[PDB]
Amino acid sequence: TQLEQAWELAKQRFAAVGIDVEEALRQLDRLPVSMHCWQGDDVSGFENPEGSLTGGIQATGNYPGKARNASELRADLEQAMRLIPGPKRLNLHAIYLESDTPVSRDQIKPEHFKNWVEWAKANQLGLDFNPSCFSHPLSADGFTLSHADDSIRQFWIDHCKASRRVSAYFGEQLGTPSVMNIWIPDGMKDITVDRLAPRQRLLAALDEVISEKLNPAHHIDAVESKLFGIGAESYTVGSNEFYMGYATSRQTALCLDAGHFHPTEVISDKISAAMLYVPQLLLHVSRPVRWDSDHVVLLDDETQAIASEIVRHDLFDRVHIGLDFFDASINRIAAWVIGTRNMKKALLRALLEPTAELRKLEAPGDYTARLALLEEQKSLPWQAVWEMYCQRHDTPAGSEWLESVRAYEKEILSRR
Amino acid sequence: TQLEQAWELAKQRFAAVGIDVEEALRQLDRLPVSMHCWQGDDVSGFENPEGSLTGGIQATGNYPGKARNASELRADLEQAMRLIPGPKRLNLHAIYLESDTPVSRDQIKPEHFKNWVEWAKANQLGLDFNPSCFSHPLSADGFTLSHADDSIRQFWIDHCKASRRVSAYFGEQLGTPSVMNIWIPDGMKDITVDRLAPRQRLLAALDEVISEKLNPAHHIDAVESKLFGIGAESYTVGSNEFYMGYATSRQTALCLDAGHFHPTEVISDKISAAMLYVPQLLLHVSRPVRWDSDHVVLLDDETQAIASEIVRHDLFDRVHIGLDFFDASINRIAAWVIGTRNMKKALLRALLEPTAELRKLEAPGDYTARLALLEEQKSLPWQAVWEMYCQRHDTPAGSEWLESVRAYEKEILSRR
Amino acid sequence: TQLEQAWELAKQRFAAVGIDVEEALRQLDRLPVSMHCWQGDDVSGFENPEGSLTGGIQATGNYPGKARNASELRADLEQAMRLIPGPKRLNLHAIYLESDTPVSRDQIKPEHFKNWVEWAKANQLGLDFNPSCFSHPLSADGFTLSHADDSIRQFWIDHCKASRRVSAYFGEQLGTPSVMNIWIPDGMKDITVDRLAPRQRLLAALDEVISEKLNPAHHIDAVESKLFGIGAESYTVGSNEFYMGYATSRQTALCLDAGHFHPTEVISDKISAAMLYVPQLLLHVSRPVRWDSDHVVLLDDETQAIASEIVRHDLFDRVHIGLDFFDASINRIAAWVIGTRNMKKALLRALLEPTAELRKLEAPGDYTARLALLEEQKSLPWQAVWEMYCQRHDTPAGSEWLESVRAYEKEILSRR
Amino acid sequence: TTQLEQAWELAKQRFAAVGIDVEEALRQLDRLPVSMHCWQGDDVSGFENPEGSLTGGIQATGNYPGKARNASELRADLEQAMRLIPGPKRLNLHAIYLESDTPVSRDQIKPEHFKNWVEWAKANQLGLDFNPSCFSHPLSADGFTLSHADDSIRQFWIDHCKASRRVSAYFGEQLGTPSVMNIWIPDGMKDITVDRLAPRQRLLAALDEVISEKLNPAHHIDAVESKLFGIGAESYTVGSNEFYMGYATSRQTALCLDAGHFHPTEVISDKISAAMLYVPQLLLHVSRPVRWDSDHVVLLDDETQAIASEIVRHDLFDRVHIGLDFFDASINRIAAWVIGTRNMKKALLRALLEPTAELRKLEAPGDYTARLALLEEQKSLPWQAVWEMYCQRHDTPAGSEWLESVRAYEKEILSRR
Ligand SMILES: C[C@H](O)[C@H](O)[C@@H](O)[C@@H](O)CO
C-alpha cells in the first residue's frame, strides 16, 4: 500500500513534468545488465582456482564465502539475481570453463561451456564472454598477444580465436549475440624504450584473431583499453588511442571501462564521441578508487552520467552494459547486488529525465534553466518508481534484500 | 495535499529507520548558509565597479543583469533569499563598502558598512566579511601581504587590520560573530626561485594583521589556501600546508575551499582532520571544473560528502558554512538559488541518515551492511522531506522557483 | 677553443658508448621545429589586433614589446631565429594575414599571405598554417564548426576550406608541405545535456572541410583535440576520442598538443599508438601548468619524452614538430628562444641515446640495464654536443643569447 | 690529463664564469647525506617473518631474483651499493629488520635487537635512522593499528612505537647523530566510510602517548608520515596530510613528506618552504610514484631536481633529512639503490651549482625573463663534469661502469640465492 501510495503520488508528480513512470519502467526492462561472473570467486576461475590473480588487477579483502566451483557460482548468481530487478545477462571468462580434463587455453570448446548455456537457458539470461589472457604461465612476462615470442603470441592468438567460437556458440544457442571482450594486461612497469613494436605485434595479432568471420547475430568482438596496472604502471600496449584506432579501423566494438582512465577522465563523455566511429560499445561500469581498483558501482556522479549518456541517446542496442568489479572484502553476493541495482537505479533515473525539454532549453542557450532543471530532477520522487519496478519483478524494494543475503550466508556461505 | 501525503509516507519510512523527519527539519534550521555577495556582480565591487577582476580568479560568461551598486545587490540578494528555505547569512567583501567619497583600503571603517548592517538586521541575516586583496594597483605585482616592498605590504596589513575592525563591528551589531576570511592571490606564474621569502613575509604580516585582540563573540579570523590561479599557476604563497600550519599555531579558523585543491583532492576528508587542530572551520563550498573556476554548487558527490561530514559530527558550531562561486554565464540569482538549496539539500539528507546505526555497523566490520545501507539511503524518500522544508519556509518545493527568477529578470534585470 | 675541446671530449665519451655525435648533429638537422607565430603578439592577429583573445585560451602577464603588425612580428621572429640553431618553419595563424582592407575569414586567399611566403623564401623557412576559429563574433557562442546554426557553421566550414587553399599555396611555393591544423574551441562551460549532436555536426563539417582534394605534397590536414578551456570547462566537442576516430577514419593527420590532456596524461605515450592508424602527426609541444596555460616549453621530462619517441621511432617525416605556447609575462623573443632551443635540445639528447642497445636490453628482459643505462645518459656530455651544434649554426651556445635579446629589447622593443 | 680531468677543468672555468665555485660545490655535496632505506634490499620482507606477505597497502612488484634474506645478505648488498655511490649516506631501518635468535613481539623490541646494525654502522661511518613497523602483521590485519578502536590492539601499536623510540635514541647516542624515527601507519578504509573522526581522534591521543617520553633531541627526532591512499585502503587514510601537518605543528615533531604520497600532480618540493615555517624539521621520502604509491626508483627528474633545489636554495643543511623510499622488486636491487642514490646526489649537486643569489635577485626584480632563461641554461651547463669529479674524488665510478660491478656481484653472489 505504502509503495502503492508513494508510487501513485509519483506517477502524478512526474506526469506533471511530462514524465511517464510506466514507460520508464518498460524502458528499464529493455536494458539488461551483463553481470560479470568473476565477482563470485575473486576472478579465480575453474582452471586453477587456488592459483593467483595476475595481470595488474587485484582482488582485495578476505571476506568469506567465495564460490569454489561452477555449481556454487550459479547458486550465488541465482541468489543475487532474485534480489536484482529486471533484465540481466551473464558475462563469462574462459577460465570459467567446465571440464573433466584440463583444457589448453588455446583448445577450448563450446562443449566446455555447455552447462552455462543450459543454465542460461533455464534462467533466461543471455551470455557474454571473454578470452582469459591473464593468470597464466604464458602471461607471466607481462605480454600475451603483443609478446615478442612467436609461439607465445600464437598461443594467445589461438586462445582468442577459439574464444570467438565459444561466443558464437553462445549466441547460436541463446539467440542473443554474445559480446566477446578482449582485455590483455600487456605492458611495462618502468620506463620503456619501445612502446612501438609491442603495439605493432598486438595489431597484427588482433587482426589474426578476428580473421574468422562469424555471424554478427551470434557474436560481437570488443576491445578494452587501460591506462595502467599494478606492476605495469608505466606503459600499456593496448592503450585508449590504440584501441580507438583499432575499433574504428576494424569495426569492432569498443569496451570502455570506467576504472581504466586518467584521474578525472570519465567514460560517460567518451560514449557519444566513440559511437560515431565504432559500431558498438561495451561498457565495463566500474568504480575506481585512485587506481583501476574495481570497487562496487555506486549510485554516483559518474554512474549516473554514464546512464544518462546511454539513455539520452536511445542506445538500447548498440550499447552493451556490463559490470566490472571485484571487491573481496564484503559479501560478494551483496556486491553484485548493490552494483547491479545501482546501475539500474541510475538507468531508471536517466529514463525519468525530461530530456527533450532539457535538450530544448539547452539548444536555446537557456543554460540557467538547464542547470536549474537538471538539479531539480534530483529531488523528484524517482525512488517511488524504483520501488515499484522492484515490486513488479518480485524483488525487494528496499534494504530488506540484505536479509536474504544474510540468510543465504548463514545456511550456505558460512559452510564453505 | 500531495506534499502532505508524500510527507506522511516519508515520515513513516524514515521513522522505520529511526529518523524523526520533524527533528530533521528543526536541525536544518540550525544550519545557516552564508551566501557570498560577489556572485551578484561578478566580484566587481563598488570601489571600482567597472575595472578588471585580478588575482587569478575570473568570472566567465556575459549574462546580463549584474547588480551595479549596493542597492541592486541587496535587491538581488533578497530575491534569492525568498527562494532559499531556512537560515542564511551574507558574506561581504571590503570593496562592497558604501561611501559617498572614495576610501583607501587601508582606511575602511565600520561606518562604510553601516547600511549593510542595518539591512542585515532587517533581513535577520548574519554577516561575514573579507579584506579585498586583489583587483588593486597595490596587488598587480601579484603580491600583497607577501610583498617585498615594505610600503605595499604595510598597506595590505593595515587594510586587513581595519577589516577585522569592520567584522568585529558586524559581530557586535548582529549578535553573531562575523567570520572574516583572509584570502590573497600572492603567487607566481612560472618557475620560482624563492618560495621561502614570500611565505616568511606572509607569516609576519598575518601575525601583525591579527595582533589586535578582538572579542571572539564578535569576530573570528580565517585563512584560506589555494593551489593555483590563473596567471599564478606555478606557485602560491599561502598554500594548504602554509595555512594549516598558520591556523594550527595561531589558532585561527581554517578556510577550506572545494575548488582550491589538487585534482581528486577533497575537502570533505579534511574536515575531521583539521578540526582536531584549528578552533573553527569556514567552508567555501564551490564547484571546480578542472580549475578554481567557481561554478555553481551541485547536489553531487562532494557537496553531499561535505554535508555528511559536518552533520555526522554535529559540527553545528565550529563549522561556518559558506559558498564561493561566481558564474557570470547564467542568471546570477538562479546561481545563488541553485547553489544554496543544493547545500541545504545535502545537509538535510545528511540529517536524515541513520548515522548511529551506520556508525555501529561500521565499528563492527559490517562493511557489507555499511555499503548497502549507505546505498539504500539514496533511495529513501528524502525529497518529500525537502519539499515540506521548502513549504514550511514559504519557498517553492520545486522548479517553480525558476518562474520567480524569470519574473524578476524581466521586470528588473532586463533593465540593467 | 674551450668549446672545441669540450666537443672532442664529448665526441670521445660518446663514441665510447656507440654514439656518433656527428651523426646526431646531422640528424638534428633533419628535425625542424615549427615556431608558432602567435607567441610574438599574444595571439592578437592582424585582423583585429586590439580586440580580445577568446577561445578558452588566454595570454597572461603584461610584458611590453608585443609586435603589432607583420613587420614587427617578422622582425622579432628573425631575432629569435638567429638565436636558434638549425631547422625551423613558421606556423601561421589565419588572423596573421596582411591586407589593406579587412577580410572575411571565410574569404581569405593566398594573396593575403604572399609577404609571409616571400619572407619564408628569404629565410629558408617552411610554413604551416591554421584556420582561426576564435576571437570572433561568430565564435562568441562557444561553437563554430559544430554550431547548430547552419549559417555560422557554414561560415566556419567555409573559412576552413579557404584555409586549406592557403596552406596548399604555401607548399606549392615553399616546396614542402604546409601542415594545416584545425583547432576549435567548441564546448560548454557547464553541465551539458547533449554531447552527441554537436559531435555529429562537427563530423559532417569536417568531412566537408576536407572534401576538396589537395596535393599531399603541398598540403596536409590535421585535427587537434582538447579537454577543456576557460569558460568551456565541462565538455569539449572535439575531444580526444572524437578526433582519434576522425583521424583514423578519414586518414588525416592527428595533432597532439601536450597541454590538452587530463592531469598526468602524456602525449609522448600517444605517439606510437596513434601512428599505427593515422598517417601523420603534428605535435603541439607546450607546457600546461594545471590548465592549458601555454607556458614556455622546458627541457623537462615530457618534452624529453616526446623527443625520444620521435627519434626512437625515426618519425622524421610523419611527425611534424611544432610549438604551442604564448607567455605574455616575459620577453616574447626570449620565450620563443628558450622554447625552441629546449625542444631542440630534447631532440639531440634523444639522438644521442644508444637506442638500438637499450632496445635490445629491453627485449631481453634486462630491465636493470635498461633503467641504469637510461639514467646515465643524463650525465653524458650531451651539452658539448649541443653547444657545437650552436656554434656551427652561428648561434650562441650559452646564455649569451640573453644579451642579444636584452639589446633588441632596448633598442627595439623599448620604443613599442 | 684524464679526459675527466680535462672536462673538469673546462667546467671549472665555465662555472666560475657564472660565479660558481665548483670546489665549493663538491665540499657542500659532502654535507648532504642521503639516508638509504634498507627495505629495498629485500622487498620490505623483514626478518621477523621474511616470507609471509607484505601488507598495509604497499606492494613490491617484480620477481627479480637475489633478494637479501637475512641481515648478512642485506649488509653485504648495502655495501656493494655504497661503494657505487659517492659521499655521505645513512641507513634507514625498519623494526622488522631486527636481529634476534628468538622471536620478539613488536611491542618489546629493544636496542639490543639492532646492536649488529649499530656496530656495522659505526664501522662504515653511517648514521642510522629508524622506523616502527606497523604493517605486515596480524594486529594490523583489520587495517587499523594506532587508530584501532580496540584498546589492546591500539596499546600494542602504541607500545611498539614507544619502544621504537628507545631504539632510535639508542642509535643517536651510539652514532653521535640523531636518528630520525619516522612514523608511518597504514590505517585507513578500502571503501566508503562513515566515521572519519573517531579514528583520527584515536590516532591523535595515541600519538601523544607515543611521544610522551622525553628523549634527547640530539639523539632522536620523531617524524610523522602522511599518506593519501593504499591498495585495499583506497578511500580513507587516518593520518592524512592535514592530519600530520596539524600534528607536527602543534606538537613540534618533524614532518615526513613522501614524494609518492599525494594527489595527482601534488609535489613535495612545494611543501618544504611552507612546512618549515611551522615545523622544526623535515624528513623527505624521495620516491617515484607511477600512478600510485608504487615505490619505483627515484630518477634524475623534474621533481627530484625541484626537491633538491628547495633544500639547497635555503641552505637547509640541518633541518632537512633527505631519505629515499622505494621498492622495486622487478630489477636488481643493488642497481635500484645505486640509481636512486646517485640520482639524488646528482640533483643535489645541480642545486649547489645553481647561481641562486643572482637568480633570486633577478626574480626579486621582476626580471622573470632572465629568470626563466637562466634556469633553463643552467641545464646545459656541464654540471656532469663536476659530478664525474665528485665521483672520482670519492673513489666511486663516474659513469655507467658501476653497472659492470653490479653485474659481477650478481654473478658471483646474487646468482646463488
Ligand atoms: C576480468 C576482466 O577481463 C578484467 O576486469 C578486464 O575487463 C579489465 O578491465 C581489468 O583490467
Ligand SMILES: C[C@H](O)[C@H](O)[C@@H](O)[C@@H](O)CO
Ligand atoms: C572573493 C573571494 O574572496 C575569493 O573567491 C576567495 O575566497 C578565493 O577562494 C578565490 O581564489
Ligand SMILES: C[C@H](O)[C@H](O)[C@@H](O)[C@@H](O)CO
Ligand atoms: C593558437 C592555437 O591554434 C591554439 O593555441 C590551439 O593550438 C589550441 O591548442 C589552444 O587551445
Ligand SMILES: C[C@H](O)[C@H](O)[C@@H](O)[C@@H](O)CO
Ligand atoms: C617502509 C616504509 O615505512 C613505507 O614505505 C612508508 O614510508 C610509506 O611511504 C609506504 O606507504
Ligand SMILES: [Zn+2]
Ligand atoms: Zn573491465
Ligand SMILES: [Zn+2]
Ligand atoms: Zn574561496
Ligand SMILES: [Zn+2]
Ligand atoms: Zn595547440
Ligand SMILES: [Zn+2]
Ligand atoms: Zn615513505
